Design a protein around this ligand. Structure first.
Ligand SMILES: Nc1ncnc2c1ncn2[C@@H]1O[C@H](CSCC[C@H](N)C(=O)O)[C@@H](O)[C@H]1O
Ligand SMILES: [Ca+2]
Lengths: 475, 916, 162, 270
DNA sequence: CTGAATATTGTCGGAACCAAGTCTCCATATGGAATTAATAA
């Protein structure tokens, strides 16, 4: 670790004589400028707002804010008072709500390292409330200047005055009033104020433009299968809502081969009767599967030494392996070569939540390193003449592969719901001719490729802002 | 103003000698001039003055003490701190020699408990001052209050011989020494503690009140639990053992026979704690012979109430002191609030216990939903109406008896109170109803014969017994031994022991069957891993007693308990319904039972103890003829399957592989191979492949047809490795064929939320999908509610009138005063002016609320009932407004049983499901 | 430490604290048995079984309990004969003899003495207490035991040897 | 209490107890060389021992387990005994624990502080902890602390009145009273001079600012007015400290005696 | 009659945390893969 040495005196600093390792790591002897909280920002005391009980207002927790300072408020009304959001209304009535004064820079107290600093810009509308866990810190040297000086830089020191204290990492306003902000940062940043705000505004306008057309990685897979099989999107999520499935004794045996009479099995059978009313392409998967393996999941150490191992997090809704291993093992099995992925395989996911079970992926990346897949995967070697593995993975990640594996997979612990070879072999998927396939794929491929192309531009301008701030504050 | 104040005033007006009088109408008190008074007592300042007046009257009249010797409100200025405190004593009774004999301090009945700590400054110091400044002898220090008993009031007091304990420290070292309880006439009282020696003029207590019980629970939790060592459950089990000993000192105690559960304060010193320990362990050892009916005499020994190391003896002495004077059994005459000791031990469980993973109970909403889904109310009503009896519920695996306490509540409340209109008199049924429950003093006496829950844990067994007893029942028919044992192993002590008989059953492995229990409700453990020697002892009464899946045995056990048509409601895991390793136990349920309802409960029900998925299964039991019909169908279709498998494997041998015919495999198979007939072959293959056959393969020829369906043929031809109980016939083929002939609907449903969301911080309401509460009661005492509102508005009006008189007096004072005091006077006038305007606004608001109350009661309830237009409680306004305002106080927390509208799981499972 | 749980718990059954103070007494009796027996003698801490099937559990109780009362007279130094005569290894009402049989049969082969130098750095009873006892009970009492590496670091950083 | 420990063997070293003049006439066994333990963080004490700790411990009012046991260490150790314990991070960082922090600072001689990872105790509680490695001071080393504690506390008490009278006069207009002090009224009449500046810099020795050395008198009274009431509020439980505000006093106390102690952090325990 | 009481309310501090979200590593039968003695032949 570190062999830091300090001298009693030091712990004299700050009105709590504290001597935890982090604070004393942040102290250091200083020779340069000091400043204080005086010639900069100013803490604002909290207050109870006058909520109007006639219109839908907004509210914002700490989880509703992101590391990029983008609040995602929820809309409450005081005419609903539903027991699902009753906690929010109760904490509002308690007095855990305030309203920023259009120019302050709210800072989260709990765990301040996750950049929850947000800006309430001057020229704006649709006033949003906030939790007392946020610190109104309204500045005197222009909000944007202090916001950008706090987000990227002045972060190794706001995070070094947190109270660990047998639990939550937490920031306190009193400690926040003690940081030793250098002047060269603010001096240089205000010196270039007239153009820094301009080009940063241009960059964030481009980011907003990219975000305006950004689409989720699952809806794309959800729409093409919905727009190609001519199934309306507003009934299979409305038929899945009603829960009064009624079956007879005779229907239990039909295609069961294990006599399973759970409720979810019967609802799966009901939904299958709806997803295939007009589609005439369904063929049993059992006759298109040639083998099935599981994998090898030894004990693993995170960021250790040995052969890397994949996890369930590496399977995404696009049928492409993430191939970004984290765990690494050092055990042997005398047959390790049987589980070293290799390009071209199809990996369905066995073991996950009731909604993330069955997600398949094709290893489309060329890797010269041997990477083991766990017992939580199932490798499918299908005939590459009728199924087109990528299409099968996309189908498994589609609502076809969700409304089935959500209701057929087994286990008493529905937090680690697992599938088995029986459900794979007894799966009546719709397989259209090879002409129809490679059209759903390809369309989905280009749409997701475009969505990924505008996913690094966002984290290119969001990095350009940071590097520009760093360069200007260092010149 | 309590009722005992009225009784005291009536007794004072009834006294021949007018030595003490009170007036509640004027709030005044008067005493005879014979008593030397150091202060003018002419107003009733509170309950203390009334109690003091009654005490003085009792001393003069009943206790025969000279009023001249009595002294009231004598000043006893002492040196307290930097200044001189001026305390005053209430009552001083002096002997013929002038020395104070009784040093009585008067306190309110509620003040009699939390003000004991002030006794050090109220009794001992003042007595020391009396002895010092007057050279007199103080004999007895009395901390006294009134105690209502029948149409009379007696003295509930702690009396301390001041000579024995001149200091408060000596009093506290002996554990709150009390030489006497009730005042004795003619300078009496013994040195030894007056023993209870019940079954006479004196007893433990029969008129216990809610406030006393709440304070007892508070102080018991404060003292016993503490924070030092042991645990939070060990203390609970020790307290349960002590309560069991207390009940033992009510079952085996005849007339006279001084109670063994008390301090036995001989002389002036508390009897040695070891004597108390020994004479309580004797009670507890005698308790494990009729209460928990333990037969092994060596197990009776080497077993104690407390560890003596986890539970110090002083805590046991304090527990005895607190609980000695409270008759748990048979004492519930607080029936103005009905049963009062059940919620006491419910609060004991809730406040002190540490339910964790493996100790948690079954949530009450699920238990109530199960009991209602069985239609147990209608079952009990019809069981009592036709042939006078009740259902005879059993709950194996009943750790805390939640399925049995709730069953008691559900049967009593809905056979006497709610649905009593569905019980036909017909003379005999009235007599049986009177016998089962009616005196209102023992409403659960019927549950001494119809509740046969079991439990394997000794501690939880005793806790369930105490639960059962404190609710007005006897726990004789609850067994603290294993629930999976030969039926002869369950002996109670009494004659009716339904869970003892056994008999072989031809249709069930020639094994024991107790076909006597009406319904079975249970929550079996999710993972039973039996001992290597307990496993071997159970492979003689269960068909699948060797599958290493012991938790399924309970399901099989449920077949040995029901009575050919017995309702069965179980909280099973979803492995039973989903995983393949349990297929056998799914066939069993489909063979003997008549599966009728399946409900999928969320993964939040048993949180934060486990996120294990659960499903409620509601299955009946087939009669003796349905099982044999199933057996006949199974045998016939299995014979068909065997013939088809022989024909199909002969076909497969001839084709693909290729045989030059053979030695006449069978007459049928070798009659067309030479003749080339294919229709018979086609139909035979279709029958043997009744499931894996498509419509496009009809035209396909045999040679490749036997190749297309080749794995299926090699699989559907396999028999069951184990559970030959079926007879080598393939389960799937024969099961489908049987289900095709006999078929019944199976109601299935899902629950999104169960009302509650418990977590490691507390509970939290959620939208219940299982059931809806009544909110608006079917019956409401309208005159009681109107009188309560009239009383509160009259009290506020009296306060307004008093403050208006004060305002008039202050105005009169202001009219003839000068500025120097007029400043303060006008300050008072403005204070009272805004105070009275606020009171007027409050009165107007309460009047509006009252008017809305008459409006709603006349619109809905009418003559202290609820009109049938809203018996379904479908109207949002009524239930919403009852869940609001002052009507929230009365309310109603009862599961609504709708009959016409169905938007709930329970409301439709009680209508679509039909029980045979 | 893992399989001696859900067999002793037994799907509910014996409480987690009952398991703990029964196993500690069982291990005390085992240590006594290893301390008394001399070369050539058969151990009392074992179950005599005729291949399959075991002897009467009552005779196993009156061979391990006697070891326990003989254990807290020579090493625990308890001298009050009344306490010795009133104490027992386990409570049969809260710990069936079958679980005692399973515990002994699981611990028959292990040699706690002279085996303590092989599992160096493994506090047996502490780890058993942490595993068996639930987290709620440990939280309201601070029953969180400091691991062997950390305590070793503490005692070696104080220069306690010096 | 040390008299509650009984043992019928070789002299029970955990039974002696004599009052200590430096600890406030309270029992000190004080026979052992090392104490190693992990305190029961945040556990409610028994009522019987809850009654007996108020009159036996220097901080008996603060009903907190981890700290009403950092004293037990002081009682057990000798004049030079060694200590090492796994304390919580709350002792080292939480501000609601300024008392104990100073106890440890006065009686014990901190010599090494290592911060264990949060992966310690992971399957059970996973709370951040640290190690203290303290040693008790000798008797002739605690008399030094006190004599300093007061030498720098009397100055703080005088400065409290002097600067709070400067505040009352220079801002919030108030005429001279002539009973304030024989030096504040003797110097206000002449001018700010150096006496006002010296006495206002000494009181504000911590916050201060170098660039504030040259500016008008009515500037260094309003910017610091929010914290003039912070270093002039003194410290609760005066019985153990002495009616001072601590931080200031402490500040110099330490500055006159310096310990070059060792600190470290582990990220992987092993 | 000045008082700074105590006596509450209502609100900062702080938690051997722990509610949400979602990834796992390991026992254990099985079943098949090896025999076997069978099994006709
Ligand atoms: N034969 C047996 N085997 C294992 N546990 C049994 C058992 N018989 C009864 N039990 C006990 O029954 C309990 C079931 S958990 C259900 C608790 C209780 N029925 C309620 O509704 O609140 C377990 O704690 C277990 O200890
Ligand atoms: Ca365990």
């Amino acid at each position: 670790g570190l062999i830091q040495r300090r001298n009693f005196s030091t712990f004299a600093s700050e009105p709590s004589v504290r001597f935890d390792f982090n604070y004393m790591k942040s102290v250091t002897p200083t020779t340069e400028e000091y400043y204080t909280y005086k010639s900069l920002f100013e803490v604002v005391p909290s207050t109870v707002p006058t909520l109007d009980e006639s219109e839908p207002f907004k509210y914002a927790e700490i989880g509703h804010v992101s590391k990029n300072g983008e609040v995602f408020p929820v809309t409450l009304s005081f005419e609903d008072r539903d027991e699902l959001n009753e906690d929010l209304f109760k904490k509002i009535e308690k007095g855990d709500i305030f309203l920023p004064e259009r120019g302050n820079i709210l800072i989260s107290a709990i765990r301040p390292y996750l950049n929850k600093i947000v800006l309430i810009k001057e020229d704006d509308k649709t006033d949003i409330y906030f939790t007392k866990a946020f610190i109104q810190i309204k500045p005197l040297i222009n909000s944007r200047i202090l916001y950008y000086a706090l987000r990227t830089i002045f972060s190794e020191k706001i995070n070094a005055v947190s109270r660990q204290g047998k639990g939550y990492p937490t920031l306190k306003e009193d400690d926040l009033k003690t940081i030793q902000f250098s002047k060269k940062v603010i001096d240089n940043l205000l010196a270039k104020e007239e153009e820094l705000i301009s080009n940063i505004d241009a960059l964030e306008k481009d980011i907003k433009e990219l975000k305006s057309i950004q689409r989720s990685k699952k809806e794309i897979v959800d729409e093409v299968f919905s727009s190609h099989f001519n199934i309306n999107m507003v009934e299979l999520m409305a038929l899945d809502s009603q829960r009064r499935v009624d079956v007879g004794l005779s229907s239990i045996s039909s295609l069961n081969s294990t006599i399973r009479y759970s409720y979810r099995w019967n609802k799966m059978k009901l939904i299958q009767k709806y997803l295939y009313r007009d589609i005439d392409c369904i063929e049993p998967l059992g006759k298109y599967i040639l083998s099935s393996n599981n994998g090898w999941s030894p004990e693993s150490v995170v960021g250790g030494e040995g052969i890397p191992i994949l996890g369930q997090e590496h399977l995404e809704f696009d049928g492409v392996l993430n191939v970004s291993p984290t765990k690494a093992t050092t055990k042997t099995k005398n047959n390790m070569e049987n589980f070293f992925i290799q390009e071209g395989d199809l990996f369905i996911s066995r073991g996950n939540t009731v909604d993330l079970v069955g997600l398949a992926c094709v290893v489309e990346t060329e890797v010269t390193e041997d990477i083991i897949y766990p017992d939580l995967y199932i490798r499918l070697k299908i005939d590459e003449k009728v199924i087109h593995k990528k299409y099968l993975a996309l189908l498994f990640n589609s609502f076809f592969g969700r409304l089935y594996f959500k209701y057929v997979s087994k286990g008493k612990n529905q937090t680690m719901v697992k599938i088995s070879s029986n459900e794979l072999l007894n799966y009546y998927l719709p397989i259209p001719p090879m002409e129809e396939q490679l059209e759903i794929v390809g369309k989905i491929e280009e749409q997701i490729g475009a969505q990924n192309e505008i996913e690094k531009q966002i984290e290119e301008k969001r990095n350009q802002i940071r590097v520009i701030i760093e360069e200007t504050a260092r010149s | 103003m309590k009722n005992w104040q009225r009784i005291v005033e009536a007794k004072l007006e009834q006294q021949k000698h007018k030595v003490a009088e009170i007036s509640l109408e004027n709030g005044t008190v008067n005493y005879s001039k014979k008593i030397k008074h150091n202060r003018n007592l002419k107003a009733l300042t509170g309950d203390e003055e009334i109690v003091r007046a009654f005490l003085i009257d009792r001393l003069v009249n009943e206790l025969d003490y000279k009023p001249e010797y009595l002294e009231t409100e004598k000043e006893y200025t002492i040196k307290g701190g930097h200044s001189k405190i001026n305390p005053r004593v209430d009552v001083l009774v002096k002997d013929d020699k002038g020395n104070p004999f009784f040093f009585i301090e008067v306190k309110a009945p509620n003040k009699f408990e939390e003000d004991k700590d002030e006794i050090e400054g109220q009794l001992f110091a003042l007595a020391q001052a009396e002895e010092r400044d007057f050279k007199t002898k103080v004999k007895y220090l009395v901390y006294y209050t009134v105690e209502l008993i029948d149409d009379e009031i007696v003295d509930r007091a702690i009396i301390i011989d001041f000579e024995k304990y001149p200091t408060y420290t000596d009093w506290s070292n002996g554990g709150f020494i009390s030489t006497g309880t009730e005042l004795t006439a003619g300078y009496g009282e013994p040195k030894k503690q007056p023993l209870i020696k019940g079954h006479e003029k004196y007893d433990l207590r029969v008129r216990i009140d809610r406030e006393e019980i709440e304070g007892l629970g508070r102080n018991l939790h404060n003292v016993l639990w503490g924070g030092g060592g042991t645990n939070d459950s060990e203390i609970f089990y020790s307290l349960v053992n002590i309560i069991l000993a207390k009940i033992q000192d009510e079952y085996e105690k005849e007339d006279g026979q001084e109670y063994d559960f008390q301090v036995y304060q001989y002389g002036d010193n508390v009897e040695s704690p070891q004597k108390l320990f020994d004479r309580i362990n004797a009670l507890y050892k005698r308790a494990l012979r009729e209460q928990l009916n333990v037969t092994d005499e060596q197990k009776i020994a080497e077993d104690n109430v407390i560890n003596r190391n986890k539970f110090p003896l002083n805590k046991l002495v304090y527990t005895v002191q607190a609980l000695e004077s409270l008759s748990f059994l048979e004492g519930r005459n607080s029936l103005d609030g009905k049963d009062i000791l059940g919620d006491f031990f419910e609060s004991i469980i809730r406040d002190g216990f540490k339910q964790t993973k493996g100790q948690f109970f079954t949530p009450t909403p699920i238990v109530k939903f199960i009991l209602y889904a069985l239609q147990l109310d209608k079952l009990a009503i019809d069981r009592l109406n036709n042939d006078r009896e009740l259902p005879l519920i059993i709950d194996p695996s009943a750790g805390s008896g939640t399925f049995l306490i709730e069953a008691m509540k559900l049967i009593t409340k809905e056979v006497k109170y709610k649905q009593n209109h569905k019980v036909k008199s017909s003379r005999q049924i009235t007599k049986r109803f009177e016998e089962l429950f009616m005196p209102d003093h023992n409403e659960n006496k019927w549950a001494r014969e119809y509740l046969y829950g079991c439990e394997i844990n000794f501690d939880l067994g005793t806790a369930s017994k105490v639960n059962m007893i404190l609710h007005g029942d006897g726990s004789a028919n609850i067994f603290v031994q294993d629930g999976l044992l030969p039926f002869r192993f369950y002996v109670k002590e009494t004659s009716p022991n339904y869970l003892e008989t056994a008999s072989p059953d031809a249709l069930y492995g020639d094994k024991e069957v107790n076909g006597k229990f009406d319904v079975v409700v249970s929550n079996p453990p999710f993972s039973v891993d039996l001992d290597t020697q307990t496993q071997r002892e159970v492979r003689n009464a269960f068909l699948f007693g060797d599958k290493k899946n012991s938790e399924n045995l309970f399901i099989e056990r449920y077949y040995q308990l029901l009575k050919e048509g017995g309702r069965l409601g179980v909280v099973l895991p979803e492995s039973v319904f989903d995983t393949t390793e349990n297929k056998y136990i799914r066939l069993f349920i489909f063979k003997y039972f008549k599966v009728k309802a399946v409900v999928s409960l969320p993964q939040v029900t048993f949180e934060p103890f486990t996120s294990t998925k659960t499903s409620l299964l509601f299955a009946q039991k087939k009669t003796k003829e349905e099982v044999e019909q199933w057996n006949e169908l199974w045998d016939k279709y299995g014979k068909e399957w065997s013939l088809l498998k022989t024909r199909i494997n002969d076909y497969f041998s001839y084709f693909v592989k290729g045989r030059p015919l053979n030695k006449k495999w069978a007459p049928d198979v070798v009659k067309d191979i030479q003749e080339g007939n294919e229709d018979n072959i086609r139909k035979n293959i279709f029958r043997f492949l009744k499931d894996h056959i498509k419509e496009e393969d009809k035209n396909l020829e045999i040679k490749d047809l036997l190749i297309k369906y080749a794995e299926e043929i090699s699989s559907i031809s396999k028999h069951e490795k184990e559970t030959d109980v079926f007879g080598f016939y393939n389960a799937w083929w024969v099961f489908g064929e049987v289900a095709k002939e006999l078929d019944y609907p199976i109601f299935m449903a899902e629950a999104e939320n169960v009302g509650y969301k418990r977590t490691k911080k507390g509970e939290k309401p959620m939208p219940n999908d299982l059931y809806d509460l009544e909110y608006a009661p079917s019956t409401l005492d309208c005159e009681k509610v109107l009188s309560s509102f009239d009383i509160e508005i009259n009290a506020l009006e009296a306060s307004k009138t008093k403050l208006s008189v004060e305002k008039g007096l202050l105005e009169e004072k202001l009219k003839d005063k000068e500025d120097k005091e007029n400043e303060k006077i006008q300050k008072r006038l403005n204070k009272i002016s805004e105070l009275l305007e606020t009171i007027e606004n409050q009165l107007d608001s309460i009047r509006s609320k009252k008017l809305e109350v008459e409006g709603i009661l006349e619109k809905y309830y009418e003559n202290n009932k609820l009109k049938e237009e809203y018996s379904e409680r479908d109207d949002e306004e009524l239930i919403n407004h009852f869940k609001h305002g002052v009507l929230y106080q009365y309310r109603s927390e009862d599961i609504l049983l709708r009959n016409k509208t169905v938007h709930k799981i329970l409301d439709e499972i009680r209508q679509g499901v039909i029980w045979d």
